[PDB]
C-alpha cells in the first residue's frame, strides 16, 4: 500500500485517450494543476516547458504529462487553449470527477478548494513532479530548483 502511482484512463487536449499503459516505454513526468484563471500563476507547467525546450529533440523520448486536479472546470478544450503557450510536447489530461479522483488517490495529491474572494476559488495543489520509469513505476520526485539545462541533463540519463 506504500507505492506512488496507479492505473488511469484520461483524455488529452486533442480528445485522444491516454492511460498509464500508453505512458510506458519512456521516462514519464507526471504533475498536477489547473488551467482556469487564478489571481497568481503557479510556475510548474512553464518550468517543465523550459526543461522540455532545453532537451531539444530528446523531448520526444520522454512523456511530459499535466493532469487536472480540477475536473469540474478543466476540459480538453480548456487544456488545449492553455497549453498553446507552452512546449508542444506537453500533454494536458481531463476526465469525469471519478477518474481524476482515482488518479488523485494513487499519487497522493493534495488538492483542496481555496475561495479567491472575488467570488471564485483556486485549486491549491501538490506542486511536485513525479518521475516514473519506462514501466510506469515511481522513481523519485523530479527537481526543478535548478537551471532547465541542469534538469534537462538529468533527464537525459534515462534515455
Amino acid at each position: 500500500p506504500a507505492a506512488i502511482g496507479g492505473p488511469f484512463q484520461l483524455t488529452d487536449q486533442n480528445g485522444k485517450a491516454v492511460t498509464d499503459k500508453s505512458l510506458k516505454g519512456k521516462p514519464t513526468l507526471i504533475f498536477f494543476g489547473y488551467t482556469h484563471s487564478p489571481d497568481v500563476c503557479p510556475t510548474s507547467l512553464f518550468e517543465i516547458s523550459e526543461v522540455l525546450r532545453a532537451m531539444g529533440k530528446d523531448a520526444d523520448k520522454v512523456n511530459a504529462i499535466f493532469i487536472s486536479v480540477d475536473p469540474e472546470r478543466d476540459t480538453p478544450a480548456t487544456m488545449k487553449n492553455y497549453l498553446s503557450s507552452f512546449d508542444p510536447h506537453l500533454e494536458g489530461l481531463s476526465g469525469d470527477p471519478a477518474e481524476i479522483a482515482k488518479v488523485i488517490t494513487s499519487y497522493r495529491v493534495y488538492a483542496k478548494k481555496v475561495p479567491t474572494k472575488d467570488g471564485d476559488y483556486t485549486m491549491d495543489h501538490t506542486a511536485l513532479i513525479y518521475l516514473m520509469d519506462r514501466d510506469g513505476r515511481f522513481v523519485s520526485p523530479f527537481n526543478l530548483k535548478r537551471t532547465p539545462e541542469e534538469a534537462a541533463a538529468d533527464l537525459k540519463r534515462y534515455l
Binding site: S37, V40, C41, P42, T43, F46, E50, S85, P148
Partner: protein, 177 residues
C-alpha cells in the same frame, strides 16, 4: 551573507513598512541585504539591457507573460504607475518572458495602448530563472522594487493595483536619492 552595499536598501524597507497595507499589503519587505542578479534582457529595439544599466534610480521590476492572465491584467496599472512617477529617480521595468510567438506580447501593448513601458523582453525567460534561484519568483507575475544600487527593497509574487494611491504612496516614499 548579505552584500553590505544593500544595507541602505534594507533601511528604506523598514521606513516605508507602515505603507505596506491595503492595495500593497502583499509586499514582503526585505529584512536582509540582497543584490539582485544583473538581469540581461532586450529593449524594444533589440539592444541588450541589464539591471545595472538602470543604476542610479529606484526601479520596479516586473516579470509578465501572456499565459499568465493576472500578469497581463495588471499591465495598465504598471503603465499608469509609469509616467506618473518615472523620472530621474524612478522607472518601472516590466520584462516580458514569452518564449513563443514573440509578436503576441508586442501586439498586446500596442492594441491596449500601453506605450510608456517600452517593450523589454527575454524570450529565453532566463530573467525568470534569475529570480527563481534567489526565491523571488514564487509565482507569476513577480515584481521586485529595486533601489539605485541594484539592491532589494521589497518583492511581490502576483499582481497589484499599482496605480492606486496605496501603491503610489509606498513607491514615492521609497524613491531617491
Amino acid at each position: 551573507t548579505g552584500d553590505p552595499a544593500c544595507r541602505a536598501a534594507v533601511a528604506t524597507a523598514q521606513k516605508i513598512a507602515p505603507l505596506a497595507h491595503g492595495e500593497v499589503a502583499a509586499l514582503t519587505m526585505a529584512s536582509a541585504p540582497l543584490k539582485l542578479p544583473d538581469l540581461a534582457f532586450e529593449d524594444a529595439d533589440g539592444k541588450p539591457k541589464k539591471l545595472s544599466d538602470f543604476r542610479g534610480k529606484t526601479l520596479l521590476v516586473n516579470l509578465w507573460a501572456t499565459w499568465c492572465v493576472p500578469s497581463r491584467k495588471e499591465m495598465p496599472a504598471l503603465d499608469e504607475l509609469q509616467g506618473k512617477l518615472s523620472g530621474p529617480n524612478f522607472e518601472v521595468v516590466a520584462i516580458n518572458i514569452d518564449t513563443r510567438d514573440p509578436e503576441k506580447p508586442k501586439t498586446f501593448l500596442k492594441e491596449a495602448n500601453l506605450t510608456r513601458l517600452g517593450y523589454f523582453n527575454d524570450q529565453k525567460a532566463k530573467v525568470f530563472q534569475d529570480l527563481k534561484a534567489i526565491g523571488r519568483a514564487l509565482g507569476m507575475p513577480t515584481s521586485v522594487l529595486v533601489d539605485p544600487q541594484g539592491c532589494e527593497i521589497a518583492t511581490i509574487a502576483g499582481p497589484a493595483e499599482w496605480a492606486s494611491e496605496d501603491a503610489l504612496k509606498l513607491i514615492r516614499a521609497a524613491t531617491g536619492k
